[model samples]
Target: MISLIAALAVDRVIGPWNLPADLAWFKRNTLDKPVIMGRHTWESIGRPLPGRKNIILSSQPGTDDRVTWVKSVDEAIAACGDVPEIMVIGGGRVYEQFLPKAQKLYLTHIDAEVEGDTHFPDYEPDDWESVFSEFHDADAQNSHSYCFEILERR
Candidate 1:
């Protein structure tokens, strides 16, 4: 199944954003799973995420031990092997690229909004059903209070 994974503000901004707690959780759970991302997403992070196999979607070809470059979402999926679930990480283009194929979404909604050049795609509430959600407040270890909502397509 394809899963769209992202963090956003109340206004839907995602970058220039911080949510260490949520990121830690993502790193722990997404390891070894295939992660499909757009070139800008890879560029923003500037390196491959450790543990997960990264498939970079770009019209341009390149080389990196950390990433396999492809031209389209279909190619990304083909390269992801037999993984049951694949995570689609952002930059808006990547989110939009995989939107039609996504079966699930994992959203981390931070309580505040910060200015950002990039943002997460808007979710259509009527198109999805929430399977579960958990809310948390910032503690000594985490700087931002956020809610994690897991949704499945209806």
Candidate 2:
């Protein structure tokens, strides 16, 4: 099965501004699925995400009851075994490392911009097709205009 990367962009800003929406959607869709991310990504989150198997891609050796660390993407994929879907969550590097292999992208585009240190990778337009999209208005619960889009490889 093909791998997946679910990302978000707030305004045109891609880092901290995008994280909340990204996490919310990730939790909703991948609650019981396995997720792979880089060590830095794991540390940045500051805690284990409940309801999903957290696989950390790290070159260093380490152990955590809540996380499994793999040295490479291949090892992370191998650890996924027969799982129907494997989501690659990110902190920039992880996204770049796995984007080419991802068959589906679930993106939330927010309508306001903020300064951010990181940015999302660019994909070839010819290689992708939008499969779904829906827009949202700013609200008390989610104070931002955004659209959730699902893109599939063409």
Candidate 3:
């Protein structure tokens, strides 16, 4: 399955991923799954994600055995296609590139608007059916309230 995961603010801005609930949700859904991301996303993360195959769409050389660097979207597809579940974890361009082909979305919607340079790509709401959702209140480790949702392509 081709899936995408993200945490975004009201303005569709991709925000910080460190919130306790968000991180837990992310790892739980993606653990042991293959994940694909863009070069910028890889640079921001600065290392290969643990317990998962980090397939990066980039021209840069792979720095770790867990990481696979591909030069194009097509190559990324070829590299990740055999997996049971592939997660498209991304920067703006990568998300935009994979959204059309993605079969499901795992999103965390932050309650507040945020300031950011990157945004999640736009898609028609009618095309997806929400399969799961749960809201989390703000807590000591998470400054903002958020809702975790999973949507499948309809």
C-alpha local distance difference test of each model: 0.83, 0.77, 0.87
Per-model TM values vs. the true structure:
0.91, 0.88, 0.92
Off by over 4 Å in 3: 15-18, 60-66
Q: Please give the distance, in angstroms, between residue 18's alpha carbon in candidate 3 and its true position after superposition.
A: 4.7
Number of backbone-clashing residue pairs for each candidate, in the order shown: 0, 0, 0
Number of the predicted model whose lDDT against the real structure is largest: 3
Model 1, span 50-140: residue lDDT tens: 8888889888777676688888878899999898999998768888777778999888888886777667776788999999899999888
| Residues 1-154 of candidate 3: C-alpha lDDT, one tens digit per residue | 7899998988899844348878889999999988899888888898888998888887767666658888898888888767778899998998998999999999999987768888899878999999999998888889888999999999
> What would the per-residue lDDT of candidate 2 be over residues 1-154, giving only the tens digit for each residue?
4455545556334573334655577678778888888887888787788888889998889667678888988899998889887888886888888888888887878776677766777878899999998887776667677788888888
Ranking by TM-score: 3, 1, 2
State how far residue 129 of model 1 sits from its true place (Å): 0.8
In candidate 1, stretches whose alpha carbon ends up further than 4 angstroms from where it belongs are: none
TM-score of 3: 0.92
Off by over 4 Å in 2: 10-12, 16-23
What value does the lDDT take at residue 147 in candidate 1? Answer: 92
